[PDB]
Structure 1
Amino acid sequence: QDNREIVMKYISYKLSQRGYEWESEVVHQTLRQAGDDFSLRYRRDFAEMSSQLHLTPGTAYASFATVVEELFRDGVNWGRIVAFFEFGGVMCVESVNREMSVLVDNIAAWMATYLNDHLHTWIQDNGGWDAFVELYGNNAAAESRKGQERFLEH
């Protein structure tokens, strides 16, 4: 899976997108693109989450854990995983904006731990990051179709 490198590479890019300096290339690039797609499609949620976080060093973990628990409460799908990356992105960007840059390493650790300890089994059972890339390439009708075909498979 190489979940930790995916995290670091992702955060390093969202922080470049904002101006600061901090597994196949296709996985990295596809995750970036999917993330930008999610943030455009769910632009109200993105902006509102940004506004409603109140990051301090003392509340960062509670904030992270609350949101991630809510995100995966009813189960996992690839879009929720993308929302998780985007959420982590937001936390990192606002950490730096607010001159709390120490949190960035913390958030990256929390994200890698969550992927390894709570998303790893799902990812493996759902075809790995290869199936993520495959789905991204498919149009919505194709994606719904391979979902029902994968269910009927195993």
Structure 2
Amino acid sequence: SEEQVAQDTEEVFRSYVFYRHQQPSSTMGQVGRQLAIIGDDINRRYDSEFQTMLQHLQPTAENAYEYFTKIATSLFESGINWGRVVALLGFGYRLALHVYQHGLTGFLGQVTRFVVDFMLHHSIARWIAQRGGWVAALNLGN
């Protein structure tokens, strides 16, 4: 009984994100579309305040599950109802996009280290060093 709900949760949540961002040939997909319409309306009034709390929480891809778990735990600790369940999806959608967007500078830093690591060991930095360093690049013209 539970496992049936769990398996359906994947399909429902997928359609929820699919239509939330937009603002699906299945019965579960229609549930996601209905929830995405409601979730978008609630998101239009109280999103601004959560933008700040997400700034201080600073969720990264590493600790995202840890923070999502105890946050959702406190959400349903005093009871469960259809309203609180919908809010869980709204939070998961926002937590997903937030951690993804704010991780770009984090991903660029890793890519920056790949280039630096490459230039060190493949004589690229030495070649630049002999031409005067990076300041020499300013002489590229005509």
**Where on the TM-score scale, by shorter chain, does this alignment land: which range?**
0.5 to 0.7
Aligned partners of 1:15 and 1:93 also within 8 Å: no
- Aligned mates of 1:83, 1:3 — CA distance in 2: 15
Give the corresponding residue for 2:74.
Answer: 70
**Structure label with greater radius of gyration:** 2
Divergent runs of 4+, >2 A: 11-17, 23-26, 40-53
Q: TM-score, normalised by structure 2?
A: 0.55
Aligned partners of 1:15 and 1:92 also within 8 Å: no
Displacement of 1:45 in angstroms is 4.5
CA change 1:93–1:46 in 2 (3 A) is same
- Aligned mates of 2:57, 2:19 — CA distance in 1: 21
CA offsets, 1:92-112, max 9 Å, x none? 101220236xxxxxxxxxxxx
Identity fraction in percent:
32
Supply the AA of the counterpart residue of 1:80. Answer: R
Aligned partners of 2:15 and 2:29 also within 8 Å: no
CA offsets, 1:74-105, max 9 Å, x none? 111111111101110111101220236xxxxx
- Aligned mates of 1:25, 1:60 — CA distance in 2: 26
Aligned partners of 2:15 and 2:32 also within 8 Å: yes
Which residues in structure 2 correspond to 1:5-154 (within 5 Å)? 5-16=11-22, 23-43=27-47, 45-99=49-103
* Structure 1 residues not aligned, in runs of 5+: 18-22, 101-154
Q: Secondary structure in 2 aligned to 1:42?
A: helix
> Which of 1 and 2 has higher RCO (CA within 8 Å, sep 6+)?
1
* Structure 2 residues not aligned, in runs of 5+: 105-142
Displacement of 1:34 in angstroms is 1.2
Aligned length: 95
- Aligned mates of 1:43, 1:98 — CA distance in 2: 16
CA change 1:26–1:50 in 2 (3 A) is same
Displacement of 1:47 in angstroms is 3.0
Q: TM-score, normalised by structure 1?
A: 0.52
- Aligned mates of 1:57, 1:24 — CA distance in 2: 28
